[PDB]
């Protein structure tokens, strides 16, 4: 009777088909490009064909098929780019066809007052059947839910756009409408608090005029845990060392798919038996894992071709990990994460820039430096900035400025760079996470951990435990977390109890709100989650399998390169 | 005065904003829209205040609220004079300078492009709270593409747009002597950086006469071990084996690996 990721797909599938039948007859389909990916998760192109869809088109391509009369547009509502595109698509067909053509628009997930104006100030508003398609979470896996907002990191942290927070709140509220209120809303970070505040406000607004019933606490849901991405920039900045992590690092993963060398699309999800075992494993054991599987098969048909696919992928990743540049990148990453003097890594960074390694990889090192050392020394700062400019272009004067606005690349003399301390008085409401303090207090460095049979979440970085997941363990696995530091620590209550002093040294507000068989816990990431953090959560989920069900929710699947691209200027003085 | 007070705690925090807006109760309507977290509502208030209030009054209200300030800033980027006005009145000179730099990247000619960079430098002067680096950077940028323009006129190849390092690399690969050293000297490129670029360029050029000539000197700022590795791959194991044993800081156990992979078993 509890929550199931499959019912989310089912609802999403029937919400769309109900609208595809609302339009009577046959229809051509024009969809926002970055929406087409997530849509493939909930419905196949074959099913859409069985409901009257002729051809498929992209909104950005501006070439809607004149063929069928019914022209149905499907795009995101809050988007500014889409509202003009659809209007410019109507103009570019209302006077450029021959037959009448009907226009239907499926906004995701709501019709906005902004979109009303854009079509109003285009005149094409009156000739459109506006419908709402309540799509929010896209179940990438049975334990992974995503809003699939691939620009949410840029919008939230660079552009300060609260849209992803609002959409995530509605999605979370939708779960409460069906399964009951979250007994506890536990979280860490400013945007985590903003989601909690919205859940409270939306609840009281649901009581409305006319009075409504109200909501009772859930009996199948334990609690919700919300982690703000800006609390732990370090983890995604590091190079992911899991198999799926390295695929995302090297090839890049979008909508459970990747492009190896037009190019071939490789499906990457849990439906494949072999990939379910490989995706979370540290890449160092992939070769041995592949050897065991291959020998078992020769000693159940898709596994044979899956063996060839992942043997080819791993072989290419192995080739990449053997390069001097890669190992140099890891060397700087490991030293900075371990706690070594950041100044000692200068010559290595200078070499990497000199060897013309890709800009995102260099910027990630600089941001790792800044975010883990509480800013960069003034003398070293200008030297770093000079290397970037004359190494990649003076155009990146904007790139460095964007990283400054993101507060990921700052001077030590800047008040925004200061890490939370208990000695240096108060000051700074937005003081940064103190990794120097947290490295010891939370055992961020575990040089033990064998990769053949991992015993801690630190295996996803070959010795480094993600701060984000460590904070989750402060709530979910208090005994274990104490055990790897203390011992002899009733005992199993919720909240941040036992670790309030430690979490205090992490960025943002700390909260634990009480709203008045095994249950499910929602671990929500605002600002993005990496595959390593997912793999870490799955590791923990296996340990809590008898007492808890764990479902991962997020605004998007993030990585180091996606973060830098939110800041990197692409224009190039030509 | 009373009619505004009664709405301050009920009901749907989304339909109190149009009511507050009609009563000319600005800011309060914007604050309520912001606290609602509804993007659609925040725009509606901003668009209303944009057409009703003077730009100056509009900026003040919007500047006090970071979320509202962000949206106005976001809408203008997708407007340019609006951005400059916003940043100037809020004393955000780094943001204003970024607008001019962003305009320079869109200029069809380096002459007009450098003029935009000059406008950016003008903004960073005055007050100048640690803007020394940016002023020198914009100076280098104007310096760089002016020299690259000379290269295109002489060498009939493409150079405008490349970084200092990329310009050195292409210059060395084409074997254009101290022209790369002139670029290196003018922009004060470090010794360790310049020698890595030169090494990579000569290897991609297979200029093993120049590499051997470089091996004919004593010290190396990056060491001779890079020279060993760089030459070995995609090149001579024979010429690579020249740099051993010049490689000072080594294994020190032992030396075999280098002599081993050089074919010499």
Author numbering:
A (entry chain A): 5 to 212, 218 to 270, 296 to 333, 357 to 546, 556 to 582, 600 to 657
B (entry chain B): 520 to 597, 605 to 791
Give verbatim excerpts from the published study on this entry.
Vps33 regulates fusion in the endo-lysosomal membrane system as a stable subunit within two large multisubunit tethering complexes, HOPS (homotypic fusion and vacuolar protein sorting) and CORVET (class C core vacuole/endosome tethering). The C. thermophilum Vps33 and Vps16CTD–Vps33 structures provide a first detailed view of an SM protein from the Vps33 family and of its recruitment into a multisubunit tethering complex.
As an alternative, we co-expressed and crystallized Vps33 with a C-terminal fragment of Vps16 (Vps16CTD; residues 505–834). Vps16CTD contains an irregular α-solenoid made up of 17 α-helices arranged in a manner similar to HEAT repeat proteins. Vps16CTD binds to the upper surface of the Vps33 arch, opposite the large cleft between Vps33 domains 1 and 3. In so doing, it interacts with all three domains of Vps33, burying about 4800 Å2 of accessible surface area in the interface. The N-terminal portion of Vps16CTD lies in the groove between domains 1 and 2 of Vps33; the majority of the Vps16CTD–Vps33 contacts in this region involve polar rather than hydrophobic residues. Interestingly, three residues near the C-terminus of Vps33 (residues 655–657), which are disordered in the uncomplexed protein, adopt a well-ordered conformation in the Vps16CTD–Vps33 complex. Nonetheless, despite the extensive interaction between Vps33 and Vps16CTD, the backbone conformation of Vps33 is almost identical to that observed for the uncomplexed protein (root-mean-squared deviation <0.6 Å).
